[PDB]
Amino acid sequence: PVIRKFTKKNVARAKKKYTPFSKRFKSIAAIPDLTSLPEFYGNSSELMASRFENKLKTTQKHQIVETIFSKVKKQLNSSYYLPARENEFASIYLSAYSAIESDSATTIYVAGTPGVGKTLTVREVVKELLSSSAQREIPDFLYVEINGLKMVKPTDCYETLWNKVSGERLTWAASMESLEFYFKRVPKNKKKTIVVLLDELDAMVTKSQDIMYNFFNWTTYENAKLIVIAVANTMDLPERQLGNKITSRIGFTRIMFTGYTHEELKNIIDLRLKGLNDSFFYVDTKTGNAILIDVRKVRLRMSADAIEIASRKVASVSGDARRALKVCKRAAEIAEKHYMAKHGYGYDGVQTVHITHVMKALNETLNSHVITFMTRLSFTAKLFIYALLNLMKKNGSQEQELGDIVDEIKLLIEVNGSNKFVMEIAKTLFQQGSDNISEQLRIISWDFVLNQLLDAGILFKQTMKNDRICCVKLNISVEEAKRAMNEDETLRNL
């Protein structure tokens, strides 16, 4: 053997071929009808995903309680119609239907902020198209969904798509060449329409931007029946990555998904609770199980004003359709927790989700814990930040050398030594309350509180060998620290 300069003992390589599709057949005229072959468009793999389904199932379960608020919590889920996206679902469906009926190619670029219903309405468009094709109104098509954030490498866009259209497992470059040949060269008499959803296209094009160009270009070929539905967070990503000339050449169909208004978001939440709001339940007072129509006949209600305020706050802040649903779900969870605590139901007149619960759910997200965190900090850490603020006042500088904090702490302890608390804490701060311990240059727990503040994200310390010149600066607003050490009486007096 040969002595190896280094070794790679954990190299794992997949069984993926190298020869592209263009070399498999003798000539273009020799390509068979790929539509009827049993491996290309899903005619081979139908139960491959079902192989792992049985691995996460168990045969043991007790009679779990279903609280009256459990239905509301379960219904206000991301998975769980389409109230507001009706002038945009219509556009996507019209474009895709026109492309499918004529065996043509197109590109739809839908862009918007998170949580505004892009992927949901694209999936609904695809479902409606599949239903229409199942009635033989439009030619049958294969739906491929590619998510840029669900792939280890950005070049797995090809490995997936080819595998979803041929059943073959090739490398990424071989898959790219195979897709180029398939779209450009294969006649339209031996193909099926393909609807590709490029969810989170932002992550795919981040280093070489060739995924965007390849996927948009394949919709320009006459023989290609590809339909690309691109989803991204920025409205001008192709204009930047590709350039104005290329994007003008491709000819997108551009759609913008604006954030939801308070009324639309309220309508979404109301439709999510259509059969549950103002409904009736049978509740077992012994165990707490609630059944929708010693039993008790109760009424479940969620106040419309709570939905008003939640929708308005979410629309003003973000406009997410996920955030309002999560706020309502958290309010329902708070109400359920209080209900179970009052009645002691545990696990295994009328009930309402009050405005206070939604206010608590919003305040949980909005409020910051920095002021509360510092209010309960140890006196040494509070003295540290007090000296930092004093140095900031004196110098007017954001970054203070650690030696300045040390000297300021010593000066603060010395100057107001007539104060009872300082007089009784000086010994425990400099000698650890012991006569056998010499006076310490740094107060007790100096490193402890310094590292505590650094880890908490309150301070930023530049990395240097000299510990007396390292500059620590507050990573928060100064007013927060001002309030935090104004709350404490000892540091306020001195």
Binding site: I3, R4, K5, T7
Partner: protein
């Protein structure tokens, strides 16, 4: 740096031992530790520092201190040969006193020059 000096020393040692003897190991001092088990013969490494003046003396000092850790094995002998283009006073100034005292235990001075003594 020290890591590459150690890796290039252990790679040369393993290659030479395999060649003279006619699996895999990690290129660090554990090879020196396990040499007696691997090859069944004692070890007599002889280091030759070609241009000591050009070598950074910080990493050279660190490498010498690292090699000192190999003295706890009964089957290893380590010799060093510094090819110096100047007097050794520069090396004395550029090395730590601990390393100077470590080297002073056994050292021989040789005046190697083509024109030496005319």
């Amino acid at each position: 740096n020290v890591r590459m000096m150690l890796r290039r020393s252990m790679y040369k040692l393993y290659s030479a031992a395999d060649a003279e003897e006619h699996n895999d190991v990690s290129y660090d001092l554990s090879l020196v530790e396990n040499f007696k088990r691997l090859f069944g013969k004692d070890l007599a490494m002889v280091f030759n520092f070609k241009d000591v003046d050009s070598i950074n003396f910080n990493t050279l000092d660190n490498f010498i201190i690292l090699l000192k850790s190999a003295f706890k094995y009964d089957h290893v002998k380590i010799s060093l040969i510094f090819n110096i283009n100047t007097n050794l006073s520069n090396i004395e100034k550029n090395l730590r006193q601990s390393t100077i005292r470590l080297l002073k235990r056994n050292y021989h001075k040789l005046d190697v020059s083509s024109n030496k003594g005319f």
